[PDB]
Structure formats: structure tokens, C-alpha cells
Amino acid sequence: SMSKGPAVGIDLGTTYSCVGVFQHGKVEIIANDQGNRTTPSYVAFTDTERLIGDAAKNQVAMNPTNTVFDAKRLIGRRFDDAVVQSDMKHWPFMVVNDAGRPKVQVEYKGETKSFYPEEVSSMVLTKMKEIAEAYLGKTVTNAVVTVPAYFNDSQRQATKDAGTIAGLNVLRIINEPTAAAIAYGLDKKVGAERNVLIFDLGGGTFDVSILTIEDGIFEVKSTAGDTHLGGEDFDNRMVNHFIAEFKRKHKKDISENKRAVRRLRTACERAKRTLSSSTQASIEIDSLYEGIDFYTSITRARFEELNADLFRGTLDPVEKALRDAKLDKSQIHDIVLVGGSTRIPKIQKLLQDFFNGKELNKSINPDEAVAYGAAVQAAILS
Amino acid sequence: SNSPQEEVELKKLKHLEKSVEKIADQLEELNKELTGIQQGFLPKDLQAEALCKLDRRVKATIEQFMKILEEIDTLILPENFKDSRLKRKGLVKKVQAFLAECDTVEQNICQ
Ligand SMILES: Nc1nc2c(N)ncnc2[nH]1
Ligand SMILES: [Cl-]
């Protein structure tokens, strides 16, 4: 049997989750069994087994109906909630009503089974706990779990319940924008009260939060954003551009061939990431459609133009948040970048220009900043 | 004009060719089982049930070939690398011919 380990920080996210540990005076983000620093918030049920994380996401094409994701969208909510009713139209898994509460319904080992969203989230939390144990070589029980600042009492309680089901001792539940501020040590800066804007563009949601830090106390002043905005929207624009390109050059429509669209979409996701560090990305796809090779490239400028309205639109939530908090943009002391999409240079440029050339807090990996702050908090509470 | 740089790409392609051979062996075993049921002792009704039991395995095979295509699609081979470009083209065509066989199987089970 393993020795007792330290307390961890867990960001239970919509699409991906992240676990960190404060050790040797620094936060270490823990890689999963597949070497990934983030784990898909996916749970799959097969004729023979239950899969969590990368293993669940990797078979989604094979088993779409029994592969649950987005349980965070449903946690702590009533079945009749507008968000539940709107969101389920887009899920390939069934969502059923059990006395006013939503449940995911799946086929598991040849039997029909239903799960509360907190049971699905507890399976993701169990996987995060195991990821931490596998790296540390010690038992992990204590953790700090993060929630969105807009989560209600029911949504907060249901997240804590997922922690309890997973065998975790939840030290504290802290807001995601608060965790990002803690990661950058914004509550340790000397001086008067500071106004913090957290720009979170990642995990299929866009969240803008404004906090005030006064004498080490965090107050949520306002929240704004778009629930379904993310990297995928940017990806779609590149996919549409390429399909149109293939039509112009070869007078062939590839859009009805799922495999051709998939090969193109996968190449676009990669090319987009390349465009955050380089000014051009090349794509070589042999026999993409009807034996035609698709050799092309896209510049950062073309990618920016294709997404101009989506990138520019990210500032509307910021203005709405500043309006609700009753603050001018000149009153913001710190700007924090959270989510993988904040790596996009045009997004950084638009936000920095809006804040009159002010430098952004972006040194910590955006996808890891929330788990980073939760891991710091977990060490503080140990 | 053979470069040491090109040997790096040919080695990546040879590894992908071996991975394709492993998936192709699974497809071969699936074809033997499909044929066995179709030409077997089971009555027509029990045959359809036995064939639909192979559905998970065919879908796993299709997915494995798709992941190989996505890995091949990450390669960038300059025009001068003729042998690498020919090997990549031949490998994609080989995977596509296997995917077409998988499609034939998938369309003949769970009908
Ligand atoms: N997670 C993630 N990484 C990136 C990146 N490198 N560039 C753009 N979007 C991204 N999203
Ligand atoms: Cl690690």
C-alpha cells in the first residue's frame, strides 16, 4: 500500500479537466497515462467496459450514443432549465427527466442505465484522482475543485457531491476566475484594492469575469460571455474556407464525405495551433477526395480575416462586464488570459489594444491556469 | 540527390506501414469470421445475429485506419523527396482500399 500524498487542485472543466500539485515551491501540472496535461471530461459505456478520459474520447466515433460529455452543462440543473432544453438537441446521448432532475441515459453491458450529472462528474474526478496517484506514487484524497463564478447553489452543491462520490475530501470549492487570479499571485500584490479582468476563452465557452481584490478578499463584481464560443468556431471557419478552395480549384464538393471533412478538420485544428507560433501553416493531404491530393497553406493573416467578426466580438462581453461592475477600462489593474484560444495572437492584440497597450498575464499555460491556482489553494489549505 | 533528411521521413512511413499491416490482419480475421457465418451451419435468422456481433470490431478497424490517415496527413514532404512522396501516396491508397473493404463489411452486417 502507498504512503499518503499531498492535496491537489482540480479544474473540472466542460470539455477537458486538469490536475495540479504544489511541490518543491512550484505547481506541477500532472500528465495523464497518455502523457496529456489535460484529460477529456468524457465517460463512455460499452458492451464490456466503462471508459473515462482519452480512452472515452478516442472511441466517440465508434460509440457516439453511449459516450457522455458536457455533464458540467447539466450539473445542478433542473430538467426544465432552458440551458438543458437547448443543449440536449446537440447531444447524441439521451437526457431523461427523473422527477424534475436530468439524467443521462445509456446502454451499458447490454442494459439501459441512467446517471445523474454528478455521477458522471464523479467518474471524471475519480480519473483525475488516479492521474495524480499514478504520478506521485502516493494516495490522493484532498483536493480543491473549481466551479464557474456564475454557478448557483444547486450547481455548486452538485459539484461538491461529485467530489464526495469520487472519494475526494473537497477542501474548498473556489471560482475559476478566482483560481486564475491566485495562480498569478494577484492577491499578494502590495497596494490598494485591485480590479481584475479574467479573459477565459477555452473549453467551448467564453467567460469574462471582473473581480475586486481588497485585503486578500475576492469579490465577483460581474460575469459576461458566450456559452458556446470556442476554438471549434474558429476551426469551422478554416474548414469552410478549405472546402470552398477545393470547390474553386477542382470543381468538387467534399462536404458530403464525412471522412474527407474529418481529415480536413483534423489538419485545420493542427494548422490553427501552428498559426499561434508561426505566420504560415502548410497542409499536405494525399487522395483527400476522389484521388485528388490537397496541398495547400494558410497564412496567420488569412486565418484572422476568416474569423474577424468572432475575434472582434470577444470585446463585447468585456464592455458588458465593465458596464455591470460599474468600471471604466482604465480602472482594470490586471488582465488574465485563460483557455487555449487565448494563445491566438490576434485575440491578445485586440484585448491589449482595448486596454491601451497594457501587458497581459499569459506566462502560465492558459489551459492550466485554473488547475494551477486550485493547486496553490490546496497547498495553502493543507 | 538522396539526403539523410529523407531517411528520417522514410523511417516514419515504414513505421506507419507496419501499423497498417497490424490493422489489415484484424480486417483479414474479421473477413474470415464473416465468411464462416455466411457459409456455416447456423439457420438464416441465427446467422444475422452472429454477423451483427462483429459490428464493434469493424468500427474499431475503420477508426484505426482513420487515425493512421490523420497521422500521415501531419507529414510535409518537399517535392525533392520523391521516394517519400511515392511511399506516402502508396500507403494512403492502400489504407483507402482497406477502408472500402471495411465499408463492404459494415453494409453487410446489422442490415
Ligand atoms: N488548446 C489550444 N492550443 C492552441 C494554440 N496553440 N493555438 C490556438 N488555439 C489553441 N487552443
Ligand atoms: Cl507530470
Helix axes A153-165, A117-136, angle to 10 degrees: 50
Contact across the interface for B59 and A282, Cβ inside 8 Å: no
Phi, psi of B11, deg, nearest 5: -65, -45
Q: Is A224 left (phi over 0), alpha (psi -120 to 50) or beta?
A: beta
CA gap A113, A110 in Å, rounded: 9
C-beta neighbour count of A50 within 10 angstroms: 15
Amino acid at A271: A
Q: Count Cβ atoms within 10 A of the Cβ of residue A274 and give its class: 0-12 exposed, 13-18 middle, 19 or more buried.
A: middle
Grid coordinates representing A356 are 491601451
CA gap A20, A27 in Å, rounded: 6
The rounded radius of gyration (Å) of the Cα atoms in chain A is: 22
User: A270 CA distance to ligand 1 centroid (A)?
Assistant: 9
Which residue in this structure is represented by grid cell 433542473?
A78
CA gap A264, A307 in Å, rounded: 18
In DSSP terms, which residues pair with A19 in a beta bridge?
A: A10
Grid coordinates representing B86 are 511515392
Residue of A nearest to B76 (CA): A284
C-beta neighbour count of A243 within 10 angstroms: 17
Q: Give the C-alpha distances (Å, rounded to integers) separating A15 from A10, A43, A161, A236, B59.
A: 14, 11, 20, 18, 24
Report the alpha-carbon angle A153-A158-A163, nearest 5.
Answer: 125
Report the alpha-carbon angle A278-A280-A285, nearest 5.
Answer: 120
CA A327, chain centre distance (Å): 27
State which H helix or E strand residue A207 sits in. Answer: strand A205-214
Nearest to A30 by CA among A377, A376, A338, A368: A368
Nearest to A231 by CA among A298, A124, A285, A303: A303
CA gap A115, A165 in Å, rounded: 13
Q: Please tell me the residue having the least CA distance from ligand 1 atom 7.
A: A273
Resolution, rounded to a tenth of an Å?
2.0
b/e sequence A132-152, b meaning 16+ C-beta within 10 Å? bbebbeeebebbbbbbbbbbe
Instruction: Judge whether B95 and B68 are in contact, CB under 8 Å.
Output: yes
CA gap A54, A34 in Å, rounded: 8
Q: Count Cβ atoms within 10 A of the Cβ of residue A329 and give its class: 0-12 exposed, 13-18 middle, 19 or more buried.
A: middle
Nearest to A68 by CA among A30, A34, A102, A18: A102
User: Strand A8-11 to strand A142-147: parallel, antiparallel, or no bridges (unpaired)?
Assistant: parallel
CA gap A327, A211 in Å, rounded: 11
User: Strand A169-175 to strand A194-202: parallel, antiparallel, or no bridges (unpaired)?
Assistant: unpaired
The three-class DSSP label of residue A167 is coil
Q: Is A207 left (phi over 0), alpha (psi -120 to 50) or beta?
A: beta
CA gap A261, A254 in Å, rounded: 7
A50: distance to nearest CA of chain B, Å? 15
Residue A221, marked binder: no
- Structure-determination approach: X-ray
| Cβ partners under 8 Å of residue B43, min gap 6 | none
CATH number of B1-111: 1.20.58.120
Residue A17, marked binder: no
Q: Is A225 left (phi over 0), alpha (psi -120 to 50) or beta?
A: left
CA gap A306, A237 in Å, rounded: 6
Phi, psi of A226, deg, nearest 5: -135, 125
C-beta neighbour count of B79 within 10 angstroms: 7
Q: Is A191 left (phi over 0), alpha (psi -120 to 50) or beta?
A: left
Q: Please tell me the residue having the least CA distance from ligand 1 atom 9.
A: A341
**Secondary structure tally for chain B: helices H, strands E:** 4, 0
b/e sequence A282-301, b meaning 16+ C-beta within 10 Å? ebbbbbbbeeeebebebebe
Grid coordinates representing B104 are 463492404
Residue of B nearest to A296 (CA): B76
Q: CA neighbours within 13 Å on the CB side: how many for A101?
A: 13
Task: Confirm whether A226 is a catalytic residue.
Answer: no
Which residue in this structure is represented by grid cell 490586471?
A334
Delineate the domains of chain A, giving CATH numbers in brackets: 1-68+124-188+362-382 (3.30.420.40), 69-123 (3.30.30.30), 189-229+314-361 (3.30.420.40), 230-313 (3.90.640.10)
Amino acid at B90: G
Amino acid at B22: K
Judging contacts by C-beta atoms under 8 Å, the chain B residues touching residue A267 are 73-74
Q: Give the C-alpha distances (Å, rounded to integers) separating A348 from A18, A223, A335, B101.
A: 23, 20, 11, 48
User: Strand A111-115 to strand A217-226: parallel, antiparallel, or no bridges (unpaired)?
Assistant: unpaired
The three-class DSSP label of residue B104 is helix
CA gap A152, A172 in Å, rounded: 16
Counting ligands in written order, which one lies closest to the CA of residue A272? Answer: 1
Instruction: Judge whether A65 and A107 are in contact, CB under 8 Å.
Output: yes
B75: distance to nearest CA of chain A, Å? 7
Instruction: Judge whether A195 and A332 are in contact, CB under 8 Å.
Output: yes
Which residue in this structure is represented by grid cell 443521462?
A104
C-beta neighbour count of A97 within 10 angstroms: 12
Which residue in this structure is represented by grid cell 489489415?
B24
Would the CB of A347 count as within 6 Å of ligand 1?
Answer: no
Residue of B nearest to A281 (CA): B76
Q: Count Cβ atoms within 10 A of the Cβ of residue B61 and give its class: 0-12 exposed, 13-18 middle, 19 or more buried.
A: buried
Contact across the interface for A284 and B76, Cβ inside 8 Å: yes
Instruction: Judge whether A29 and A20 are in contact, CB under 8 Å.
Output: yes
C-beta neighbour count of B33 within 10 angstroms: 15
CA gap B25, B45 in Å, rounded: 29
Q: Check residue A88 and report its DSSP letter.
A: G
DSSP characters for A291-339? TEEEEEEEEHHHHHHHTHHHHHTTHHHHHHHHHHTT--GGG--EEEEES
